[model samples]
Target chain A: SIIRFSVSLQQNLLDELDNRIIKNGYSSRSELVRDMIREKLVEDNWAEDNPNDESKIAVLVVIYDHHQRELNQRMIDIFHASGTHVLCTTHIHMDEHNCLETIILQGNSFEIQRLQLEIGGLRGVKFAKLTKA
Target chain B: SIIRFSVSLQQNLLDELDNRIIKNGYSSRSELVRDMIREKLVEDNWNPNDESKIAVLVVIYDHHQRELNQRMIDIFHASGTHVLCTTHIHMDEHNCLETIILQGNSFEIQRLQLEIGGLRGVKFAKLTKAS
Candidate 1:
């Protein structure tokens, strides 16, 4: 059964929310709220999980300088050793010097985070962000 | 100078992002990426400072637990943080989901969350920075 309730929010906040809903094509507030809740739940699950458990899905986005071939090799080496399944990788050349790589991983939380840190610490990696829940 | 690069993504994922970019009226991928990078930088800046900030706290609790509602009110009343507002949804007969918007220094906000999250009836508590 679907339950509903009213929430009190500031007018400005509500207005921004309305705008987002319209822009994102969300059918209603309930839909957006539900998706947010689910996303939060995934984060919580990852946080609370035992390190030895089965793999969970994770997405890592990285922007780097492709000119550093050594950094690329090191990243590849670490990924090979991380004991995680690489679901897929998408690489994009942003311009002459920059590249963006989005890698989807299925692994235990510990390994996934470790891989993220390793890649993010590389000398040429400009930015690395992980979205995993 | 801003460096340009390319990243290869699966066709499906790219399509999804394109759909979102169009829906959200983003002029280009660079515009979206620039905005996201800035947002990440702001999030990274949420440190131990005393600067005032906004946060959203989500909590799931068992409403049937004795005096949980009263405890929630009392906790909010005692907090130094400003309660911008709160939203509550009934997840089930026993469980309630609450999202609270608060404004305060990071320490106060974290303190409030710690107190509420440590409550016996709360099944889960998580905080997201609103700014």
Candidate 2:
């Protein structure tokens, strides 16, 4: 059910939120708030300690220098050793020197982050982020 | 600068190439396939045809039923509207779905799913699927 809610914030704080709303192309204040809250949820989910280490879904997006020596193999080697299921990967020949890949992985948090850190630490890995499922 | 050789494939047969490679996620035979041949590139670089419309989506919720109906209306009504396929999976109490139809570009697809996630009913939505 859709319900209207009231939020009270200092004018300056409200302005900052508004700034992000417009800059981020959010359709409305609710949309902005909703997304922000959702992001926090994802962060919280990642922080939770699961005794069972259940199957959790996540996607890791990375941008790297494709020309980096042996970087590609290192990336694969890290995955090959990880206890994760790589559903698929999207490779972007972003440029002559850079490539962006979004990899879909399903695994427990411990192993997934291990894969992330190992690969993210590699040379030429300019950027890496893990998002929740 | 580096030079990579090129080869052409028969029309629909080229799709066969994409289907197999993607299904297995080898990236390319060597990540050196030169599919797009790089540069002249970046955002609009690569092969103009394979604009990398690749993306993925995730959503978490306890909004009862509103999120479902809300997303249904939005996704169905919006006619960038062309959809390819969808699969449903059961995940404990909540359900997870993987249904990204090949759209024109990844940017538009991201926005469309964002609009769905930001709706009141859905709690968490993440993006996936490769272009």
Candidate 3:
């Protein structure tokens, strides 16, 4: 059964929400709200994975200064040797000097974390973020 | 020589920017000047641990589901990382926006992103870098 309810709020909060709807390009608050709910659902699901379960999963995003000496080759070598399952990588060149790459890796959290530390913590590498979904 | 460019703006937009500066305590108007510059700075930082970069992970999902919250905490633990903070806003009874601020290598950050992404019910995720 579905029940409809109403919320009373100060006009200021309502104004801010309306602004967000336009700024972020949402059709309606309901649609935006639906997305928020789904997001929490996913976060909750993450808790269920076995703490030490070696599940094959994750994505690695790395940005680096391409001019840095042999940085690209060294970074690739580290991931290749980690025994992780590589899905693919999407590369973006922001300008003449920098490169941003998103790599999808399949492996347990432990392995993925170690791999990320190796590549992300490297010198010459500008920035790296690992997003596991 | 520097290449000069021109842009047209609405009064409303300028007012909003100034308001934000006042609210956020931006000391000078010149620092609040470029719409794109600050955006790019933060976005670039989220790329890796190479420089001091700030970012917010916008995660969307349901809360009523089974064990999802616990799994998220586990993933964070697996990373062996410390996050700056997390600001959670409840959009409705079912949905929420939990923006997590973290400083680390882009790899470790993305590892967390994908970890959250792979979950079954998460609808949308956007990582915003602060300039």
lDDT of 2 by residue, B1-131 (tens): 33222233343434544454565464553231222112101222113434445443545555356457556556735735444443334444665434343444534554565666656656556555442
Quote the positional error of residue B92 for candidate 1 in Å: 33
Model 3 lDDT tens row, A30-68:
443333333333333343444466654555666678888
lDDT of 3 at A38: 39
For residues B28-93, could you state the per-residue lDDT of candidate 3 as single tens digits?
433433222333223343133553454556576887768877887787777664566665555568
Candidate 3 chain B lowest-lDDT run of ten? B1-10
Q: Which candidate is the best by TM-score?
A: 2
Predictions in order: lDDT: 0.64, 0.57, 0.57
lDDT of 1 by residue, A1-133 (tens): 2333343444444454456456445556545444343443355457654777855765676768889879888988999899888866666665687775666677798888889889988998987767663
Q: TM-scores for chain B, in order?
A: 0.59, 0.44, 0.55
Segments of candidate 3 deviating more than 4 angstroms: A1-19, A47-57, A81-83, A92-94, B1-131
What lDDT would candidate 1 get against the real structure?
Answer: 0.64
Question: Per-residue lDDT of A1-109 in model 2, one digit per residue for the tens?
Answer: 2433344444544565566555436767655554444343344456666636657887687778988999999888888899888876767565697676767688888
Error of 3 at B124 (Å): 7.0
Worst 10-residue stretch by lDDT in candidate 1 chain B? B1-10
TM-score for candidate 1, residues paired by index: 0.46
